[PDB]
């Protein structure tokens with residue numbers, strides 16, 4: 004599962 | 013220009 | 022970094038990100054935090070980007086080494102996994118120390134306080150990923166407690182489309198699924214967060230809509246993986 | 249790494265590569281070299297992979313920072329470019345020191361000696377990429393001299409399809425084009441190397457053919473870029 008990335012990309 | 017890579021990939 | 026100006030540390034953190042020098046970026050942002058002033062929104066993102074990338078690389082390496090070690094069921098693989106694990110724990114302890122001295126206590130606006138408590142939950146979650154046994158229980162509870170305080174503030178003070186509120190819920194749902202052995206809680210939180218954001222999108226500008234829908238898609242991607 | 253066994257350093261360098269921990273990998277291989285024994289073919293490749301990756305990341309960051317600095321035509325961009333440059337020079341000096349103490353002097357077989365002299369040319373070439381002015385002239389000549397000695401041995405002792413001979417010629421041709429301002433020499437060397445390898449492919453097994461043709465394609469890719 005994915006957590007929030009550091010930047011929008 | 014490319015030089016030799018460290019591994020074949 | 023005590024002899025470097027705050028503004029120079031910030032500028033160099035931005036340069037380090039452009040150069041993909043994330044260890045440097047984290048050291049510059051640690052120096053900036055240690056100047057003792059509060060961080061702006063942009064500066065908070067620099068701090069989070071830097072450490073998330075550093076610890077993200079350590080986590081990926083720890084997972085590679087842990088898989089090799091488990092397949093092996095000499096001492097070298099365990100020793101090297103332990104070395105990487107200790108380095109990872111050190112970085113998490115550094116971030117947690119910055120949050121505790123004194124970012125959280127000085128953060129009064131909802132946006133800053135939720136941001137820092139979300140980070141606190143994240144870095145305890147990364148500690149929990151490598152922890153075993155009992156202290157593991159207390160580390161898990163420390164992550165839970167930080168995320169829960171951030172959730173309580175976010176629900177009272179931010180709209181359901183706010184990107185920090187959304188990212189907090191995303192990460193707390195990952196905590197429930199991957200750390201706390203509560204997949205139903207993870208799914209419920211992701212679904213409720215998604216649906217309540219969907220119902221508030223009509224209030225947003227094009228640019229805010231793009232930000233909220235991006236994180237909504239991350240929630241949906243997890244829901245697809247989990248269901 | 250003086251208290252760690254040679255074989256453990258080698259094993260940990262292999263693990264570090266699998267975990268994409270190239271700084272660790274280079275530190276393990278430096279420790280292994282400093283045990284004082286000669287390196288096998290596989291160990292030479294571990295040493296080269298580790299440092300090529302470390303310096304490759306430094307070069308990429310230096311290029312990003314140098315481009316920002318040139319576009320700018322405060323002191324922070326120059327200071328940070330200088331920091332990265334000093335770190336890069338330090339790693340190159342470390343590799344050159346390993347080659348000089350004492351890998352090259354103990355390397356008697358053509359394969360090992362050419363390998364190490366090719367590395368010596370490469371690390372002087374990386375120093376030349378960031379050098380200015382006069383000491384720049386001597387650094388360029390040090391790269392040239394190392395590559396030339398390696399070329400002389402390779403032409404006497406290895407077939408024209410040998411992958412070390414081919415990679416040496418590839419890198420020396422990059423030196424001519426990018427460092428020595430000799431694009432015609434670069435093109436001539438790449439073409440002659442390619443053609444002489446092509447004429448010897450009939451002697452090779454499937455596996456040797458695959459290795460030689462891979463590097464031949466790298467020579468051709470450069471020739472396409474340069475012509």
Ligand SMILES: *Cc1ccc(S(=O)(=O)N2CCCc3ccccc32)cc1
Nearest residue numbers: 007008009010011184185188232235
């Ligand atoms: C935890 C967190 C959530 C959102 C933000 S942000 O400033 O709104 N932003 C930058 C980081 C990732 C991102 C993805 C989608 C939309 C906005 C963002 C920061 C931190």
Ligand SMILES: *Cc1ccc(S(=O)(=O)N2CCCc3ccccc32)cc1
Nearest residue numbers: 016017018019020411412415459462
């Ligand atoms: C400088 C050099 C050239 C070849 C070799 S290798 O051991 O033959 N090998 C590994 C590295 C890259 C590579 C590419 C294609 C074919 C073989 C190789 C090592 C060093």
